[model samples]
Target: QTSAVQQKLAALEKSSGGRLGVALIDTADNTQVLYRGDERFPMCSTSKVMAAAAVLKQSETQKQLLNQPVEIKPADLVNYNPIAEKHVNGTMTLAELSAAALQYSDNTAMNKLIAQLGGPGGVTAFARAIGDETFRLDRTAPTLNTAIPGDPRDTTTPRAMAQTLRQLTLGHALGETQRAQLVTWLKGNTTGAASIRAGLPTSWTVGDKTGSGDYGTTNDIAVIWPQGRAPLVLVTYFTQPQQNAESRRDVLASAARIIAEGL
Candidate 1:
């Protein structure tokens, strides 16, 4: 049966002049609804999760120490996010860097993760091997200038991202311990506090990653665990040239409320 959440999301799509892409799944019942979920959008910083996954996978096979110390020289810097640049000094462990990558959505830290996993190709290859057909990572984070010929950085699908999160939640992608660690990092994410989590009930918890572009692209993907209930995998993307940031946030909040209230 179609759900109230679906009806509300449809109404949201009709009223907004922009495109709204969402992939919502009720894990306990295996019920799902997709609104323009197949369409592509700029992955933005949201691709950091994919990159982190690749690195974690490689660590399992290569026995790469997660606690290994990594150095970031001055020449290896990119000024995409001010918070990262202001504090991008000294060396940090792989674990610490991964925290920065997820917590702050730090691009420089993501670059290190990609490089450790053998560059963008590693991320793309691992994701495809793991059943993600929507991720096309060609550019490094923090610095979009790492694009090769004919390769673009901005690419992803809402369903693909949400499905990947589902796999992670079910231990189909990464190990159980790694999945827990990733969720911890995601929940600790300080960035995007105003994105999906803002819409959720006060007691509900959501571990999410957010992405934004200059052209009104606002993306958020998350593992939403409502208070005393089954979890939902929710991914929302908005791309309308005229939509402002606050409106974009409210849209996500409405979506969250729809799910929360319906449940």
Candidate 2:
């Protein structure tokens, strides 16, 4: 049976002329709403969340890792590096880099963290460590956002992303302190205001990450807290054929409203 939510989502997909993949999980009851949740989509900067998780996990063993100073060079800068670009040839703490990567979607900071993690493969290893086999990162920054159709590099299914987010944030993947730090960074994200966050009620608290790429790919992975209920994990990935087509935040916002209504 196609529920009203599913029907509306289908309509939205049709009207937008794009492929929309969504995975919504209500943690309190384990209820889920999935639409093309298993299909592959380019991760874009969304993979920075995994990179941040890897750093938090590593900090668990390497005390002072987060506070360690890291040098940034001119060569490290990549497209869309608003924050890190200002600090070129200077130093930022590992913690600062991680925050910049998530909060500002700083490409240079993301690539720096990826390099620190021993390249894209290391972030994949961290996903595996957290029991997510489908989540993979094969490239860094701008290049990873190539978002070529049918290309599996730097992509993960909507379901995979939601599950991984649930584990790292709500599950016991990270210690309390580390998990709190991650939540803080996500909550401070500067890029998602017009996306899922816009659709949510003013009363609910949300922490999210947004990703943009070629082919009009726009994605948001979020943990939303409704009053008096456990957090809900929502992942939305949308893509259209037009490479230069405007990425639609309204699509994701509308989906978020439908999800919130269903809840």
Candidate 3:
């Protein structure tokens, strides 16, 4: 049985010419709005958040991990790695690498962090530890953005992503300081301005990560603090098959607006 919100989202999908997966949660009252929330979507650079969490978790046991110097080689760089590319053959601390990945979506920094975490499997392990069984990271960046139709590699459901994000940012997934650090990095993300953040009220605070991939895939997962209201966890993933069909940032923004109107 479809509700009015689902009907509205279905209409939006028709107009956008893409498949949409959304999961919105009101943490204060535990109310939710879901649309194909269990369906899988490519994780893309959005996986950086999980990688960051894994690093923070490791730091709990290894007090010096975040400060340890990490070497960045020329060959380590990939497409869209502005920060790491500038620092090629240079050294950066583990914390700086995480920031580069989260704030700038630096592919080189993401790949390096994943390698340090023992590859994609290790990140998946961290997700599982946090109670998100469906979360998976099978490949590194550049390759992970392939977004092949029907492929499950490096994908997670919207609900799973939202829940995992909720745990990391709002729940008890990491130590207090570590969790605060993760939220701070996410709040600094420079990639989501045109998506969810654009639709939200200016007075609200948001921390988010954005992902782009093949097949017109564009995704944003966020934790929003509405003024005088409880925090909301929102996830939106959009994709279309037409090779020339551009990923619509407005689709995400509009969907966010519709969701916000109901709140």
Candidate 4:
């Protein structure tokens, strides 16, 4: 593990263009690392991760199956991503929203699911339940897409998400069934760059989330590990996104690859 850490750190530092804030936990034993900007860094669509957690929690508490049907009225398609549009206004299930939210980080799907999870209060409660004591709803407000002159609405820290995901993994914050559901959702994640998926064996299943916010932050939160080891979760946030998508993704991918090699 030490060698893996050294390998990943060196590669990540080199690939990221020097902008990185990371938090990693040896999900096997709960060891961790916290870095600079460990407080309220912008999170972007990553907020959906919390919203998804909250939704699953509610479902568990209410004995509601993940497939509970709900209407995504066309009126709500205002912010729908092309993917969400496919299921919008149709009688889709919560499971589908969960899938869409994580798999594609679909904004419209998340907005609807977050509302269904009992609104911002629900997401906050979910976050607190997991011991991620920070992270405010205002940080992800759609009204202020860019909180600063040239920034983003989403805000979080690698440490916070690590706790959040770990809580879900431990089956404490959301309940075992919900945690399982959360893992299922994460397994289908499709929007993240190749970073988090680069090092693990092809046969190994990876569950994760990715967020892209304007021109500022690129992030990935993943639960990963080899077959013989306990699952380890790595959450990373990179801020040197002054470059274009392809370039930024390449740099972020480098960071993920580094982490993978280290793990």
Model 2: CA > 4 A from native:
none
lDDT tens readout by residue for model 4, 43-118: 6666777888778777865766567887766766744366667766576677777778788777777776777856
- Models 1 onward score TM values of 0.87, 0.98, 0.98, 0.82
Per residue, candidate 1 scores C-alpha lDDT tens digits across 184-247 of 8888888767778888877888888887664466778899888877889988877665434333
Q: What is residue 119's positional error in candidate 3, in angstroms? A: 0.5
Residue 90 in candidate 1, Cα distance off native in Å: 2.9
Per-structure clash totals for the candidates: 0, 0, 0, 6
- Per-residue CA lDDT of model 2 for 40-106, tens digit only, reads 9999988999999999999999989999888989998878888888888899888999999999999
Off by over 4 Å in 3: none
Query: Can you tell me which runs of candidate 4 are displaced by over 4 Å?
Result: 1-15, 65-68, 78-80, 139-153, 199-203, 241-247
Candidate 3, residues 165-212, lDDT tens digits: the string is: 999999999999999999999999988999999989999999999999
* Shift of residue 73 alpha carbon in model 2, Å: 0.8
lDDT of 3: 0.91
CA lDDT, candidate 2, residue 123: 98
Residue pairs with clashing backbones, model 1: none
Off by over 4 Å in 1: 1-4, 62-64, 81-89, 143-153, 242-247
lDDT of 1 at 178: 76
